[PDB]
Amino acid sequence: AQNPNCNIMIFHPTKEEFNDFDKYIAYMESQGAHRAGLAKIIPPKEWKARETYDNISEILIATPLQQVASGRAGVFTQYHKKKKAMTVGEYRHLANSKKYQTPPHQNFEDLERKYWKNRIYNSPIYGADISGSLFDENTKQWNLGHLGTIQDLLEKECGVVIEGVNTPYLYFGMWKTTFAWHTEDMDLYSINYLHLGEPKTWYVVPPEHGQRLERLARELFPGSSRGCGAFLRHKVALISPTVLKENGIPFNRITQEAGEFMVTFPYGYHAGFNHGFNCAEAINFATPRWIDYGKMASQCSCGEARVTFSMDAFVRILQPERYDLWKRGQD
Numbered sequence: 135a136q137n138p139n140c141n142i143m144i145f146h147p148t149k150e151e152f153n154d155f156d157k158y159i160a161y162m163e164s165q166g167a168h169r170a171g172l173a174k175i176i177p178p179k180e181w182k183a184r185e186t187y188d189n190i191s192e193i194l195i196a197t198p199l200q201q202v203a204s205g206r207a208g209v210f211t212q213y214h215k216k217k218k219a220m221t222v223g224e225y226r227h228l229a230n231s232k233k234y235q236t237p238p239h240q241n242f243e244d245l246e247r248k249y250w251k252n253r254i255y256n257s258p259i260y261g262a263d264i265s266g267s268l269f270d271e272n273t274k275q276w277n278l279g280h281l282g283t284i285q286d287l288l289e290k291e292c293g294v295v296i297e298g299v300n301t302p303y304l305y306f307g308m309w310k311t312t313f314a315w316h317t318e319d320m321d322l323y324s325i326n327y328l329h330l331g332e333p334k335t336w337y338v339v340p341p342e343h344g345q346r347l348e349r350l351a352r353e354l355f356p357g358s359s360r361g362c363g364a365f366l367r368h369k370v371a372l373i374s375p376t377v378l379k380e381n382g383i384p385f386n387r388i389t390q391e392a393g394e395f396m397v398t399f400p401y402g403y404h405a406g407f408n409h410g411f412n413c414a415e416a417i418n419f420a421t422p423r424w425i426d427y428g429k430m431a432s433q434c435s436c437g438e439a440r441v442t443f444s445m446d447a448f449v450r451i452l453q454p455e456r457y458d459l460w461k462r463g464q465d
């Protein structure tokens with residue numbers, strides 16, 4: 135069995151290997167990459183996403199979100215307070231202000247220590263889930279707006295044609311902006327490209343061990359767990375690496391830098407934080423191997439998770455027994 139310790143693997147494809155996206159994902163899996171839940175892909179030196187980032191300041195962040203924490207430094211939830219619209223140039227200025235800017239630090243490990251010590255005492259503002267793309271239309275390789283759609287994959291594997299679309303999303307971050315512990319909708323894959331700016335640190339639990347994280351989360355967030363049998367779908371709970379280690383939860387960590395891709399694999403729980411002002415692009419995708427995970431994915435039906443239009447068909451076809459309860463939670 136390849137990668138039996140479930141380490142995060144880093145890949146350096148050649149320009150020739152960068153042509154066929156599906157083939158390369160399958161290659162990474164042949165080497166055991168999925169066992170970690172997360173892999174890094176460093177593009178060949180010949181590749182670029184676009185020519186420059188000099189002309190992005192006029193993108194609008196219609197609903198910036200202030201991430202307010204509650205709890206203790208290593209075990210907390212966050213809620214998202216809506217703020218007034220601002221442009222990417224305005225948001226960049228805010229991220230660099232004395233109130234929000236990255237503090238002085240020695241290295242990524244020192245900054246990680248500072249994050250976990252101090253995160254809860256601040257409320258950073260995140261531009262999330264902005265439909266759009268920064269890939270140039272002429273970028274032919276690993277262009278996240280030109281991937282094969284999940285609806286086409288389901289039709290190819292299973293024979294059923296379904297409604298829905300699959301487009302990318304932009305994220306504008308600042309110091310301490312946080313992504314809570316989660317798997318993807320319907321336990322899909324994700325791919326994330328860090329277009330510019332400061333790093334993103336990731337934590338991940340191997341898919342084979344995801345239920346260990348879920349059991350800890352139920353213990354640590356006992357009211358939330360009574361409220362919903364899949365409350366991590368709410369995407370609000372944080373648990374630090376120190377707390378994970380104290381509770382024996384298997385996990386790994388890695389820092390993504392500008393110009394690098396990360397892939398999350400089906401049922402790979404992940405969480406993390408941004409080091410400073412940055413911009414990332416991400417999208418969900420599927421392969422044949424996903425279908426069995428989609429059939430078994432948990433679902434939130436309490437009303438909190440609320441998701442895209444295109445998840446309806448996935449539940450309807452892959453999980454017909456759950457569909458009526460889930461759809462009630464959507465309405």
Ligand SMILES: O=C(O)CNC(=O)C(=O)O
Nearest residue numbers: 305313324325326414416
């Ligand atoms: O970068 C972020 O805030 C969160 N991204 C992801 O969870 C992802 O790409 O799957």
Ligand SMILES: [Mg+2]
Nearest residue numbers: 190191192193
């Ligand atoms: Mg612009």
Ligand code: NI
Nearest residue numbers: 317318324398
């Ligand atoms: Ni994710």
Ligand SMILES: [Zn+2]
Nearest residue numbers: 362434436438
């Ligand atoms: Zn719920």
